[PDB]
Write a protein that binds this ligand. Structure first.
Ligand SMILES: Nc1c2c(nc3c1CCC3)CCCC2
Ligand SMILES: Nc1c2c(nc3c1CCC3)CCCC2
Ligand SMILES: [Cl-]
Ligand SMILES: [Cl-]
Lengths: 306, 306
């Protein structure tokens, strides 16, 4: 028992982290096979970042201007190209530690682990979600760009995020490993503001199932609701609309606990309307929304990875 | 910016995890050099656990009864001995992935990372603290025993915890790597209950410094206090007494922010007396106590590890 915000084991990704320097800018790269992936803004100065013309800036760069170091050992760059907002640096040596992997573009509401790095070196690991406004709420300092987000299925690392930008409000924006930003964000230092940070309703319900499984049950009540009634309340509290697809995804947790999904929605409705009254659920005083239903099942059944 | 509950990169420890089976019991072991460390209750049946005589139970075990598997490959056990509440299984092959390491016995209030494992395989990683009642609040299911807790300093893993027991209240008890339990707990299935879970006051203050550094500042007020006055309030709220040693440890965060430690105590005092009034700090609705002052500095300055 117990239920904790848990990241994937980071070792397979640690093995892929390198340092990339272009001019006076150093950040991180991801070394898979004979390709190192990194944010294209490695080519920019700070001045450049207000209005960068990436194609033009790249003309002045040759393979030997990209300094790629794996631990203490330099890699030889034999080619480079820009794909969307990432650079792909071809190197002459395949990473011997390349795991099985995929590139995935995740949907808002999905969770993933981030291996925060500086100068190619791992600092720590934590769990994140892709917010409904396509930001993430991370922990990133200058030099952390190129840190990546990932999920693991047994032995296969699915990379889904690469860190590029901090907005003025202190939330974070980045790309998938094809170099496409999540949401409307761009790699320029400009006025771009995040929209409404809505709560991931299906994730809160999953976490309330997690609480029940772990003995925290004070919030179960005598009521039920419907999708349409519940969603009048979700709207008022900036919660995502609950859909029948969400209901179906919560089926296994419903079966395990014997609590109908709509009954748990009625618990959630009362918690939204009444507050926690100074009580806690799984050691939180607010409703946690960065556990997916798959996360809950995984943690509550003990799934492992090679 | 941003501030997250962050674990150490788990790779160096992943490399040390093995599976240990004795009879019909399987749990995890830690393979360092030519020794595999595991909870001595691997020798017990469930029946045994109400009143085990470990010395007597061990007489019936030989080296070949301890099945140790590292991934897909079996290790040969050439000796075994009991030290306190752990077994040390000597194997014929030094772990080729042994990191630089130490065994440390931590003090209450110190934090560490746990690599949760089942059948020798990593499941996930999360951050914990040694509570003032010598429990930890973990995420552990049947089969997770032998999972370990650790800190990393550059390239050296300091192992501090090995998981042994769940209490009936759903909190967790374990040993250092010399096999001595933290607190009063024993490896028997009995009536043993945790004491008061007091809040780690120095850690809350560190986290309030973290909040300020990250722009969350609504709780700074016009007041100050003294240690003795503050501690009348800590006592009322089951907070650890603040000491001059605690004040000294918070010195660097005080210097960085320009907020005197006692002024921040006066902020904390008002938060304890008044509540959060429905507000949040670093995305929490309660006062977080599982970040040390060293953790805050580390995360706020971007320290890394080889
Ligand atoms: N209504 C309160 C009050 C206090 N503290 C808290 C709540 C809600 C949960 C924390 C302390 C002062 C009186 C009212
Ligand atoms: N006093 C309240 C009330 C509500 N919800 C909350 C608090 C504290 C923070 C959450 C909703 C109902 C009225 C009072
Ligand atoms: Cl997980
Ligand atoms: Cl840390």
């Amino acid at each position: 028992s117990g239920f904790r915000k848990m990241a994937f084991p980071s070792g397979k990704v640690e093995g892929c982290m390198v340092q990339v320097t272009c001019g006076t800018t150093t950040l991180n790269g991801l070394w898979l096979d004979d390709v190192v992936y990194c944010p294209r803004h490695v080519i920019c100065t700070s001045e450049d970042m207000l209005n960068p013309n990436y194609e033009d800036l790249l003309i002045r760069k040759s393979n030997h201007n990209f300094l790629v170091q794996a631990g203490n050992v330099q890699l030889r760059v034999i080619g480079h190209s820009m794909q969307n907002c990432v650079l792909k640096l071809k190197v002459d040596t395949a990473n011997p530690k390349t795991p099985k992997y995929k590139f995935v573009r995740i949907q808002p509401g999905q969770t993933f682990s981030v291996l925060a790095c500086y100068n190619g070196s791992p600092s720590g690991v934590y769990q994140c979600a892709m917010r409904p406004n396509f930001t993430i709420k991370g922990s990133f300092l200058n030099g952390s760009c190129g840190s990546v987000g990932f999920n693991i299925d047994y032995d296969c690392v699915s990379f889904c995020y690469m860190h590029h930008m901090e907005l003025p409000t202190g939330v974070h924006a980045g790309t998938d490993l094809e170099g496409n930003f999540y949401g409307p964000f761009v790699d320029r230092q400009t006025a771009q503001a995040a929209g409404t940070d809505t709560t991931i309703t299906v994730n809160v319900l999953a976490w309330l199932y997690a609480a029940v499984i772990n003995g925290d049950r004070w919030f179960l009540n005598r009521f039920t609701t419907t999708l349409n009634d519940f969603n009048l309340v979700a709207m008022k509290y900036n919660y995502e609309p609950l859909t029948q697809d969400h209901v179906d995804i919560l089926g296994p947790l419903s079966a395990q606990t014997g609590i109908a999904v709509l009954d748990m929605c009625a618990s959630l409705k009362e918690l939204l309307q009444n507050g926690m009254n100074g009580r806690t659920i799984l050691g939180s005083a607010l409703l946690e929304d960065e556990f997916t239903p798959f996360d809950v099942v995984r943690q509550c059944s003990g799934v492992t990875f090679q």
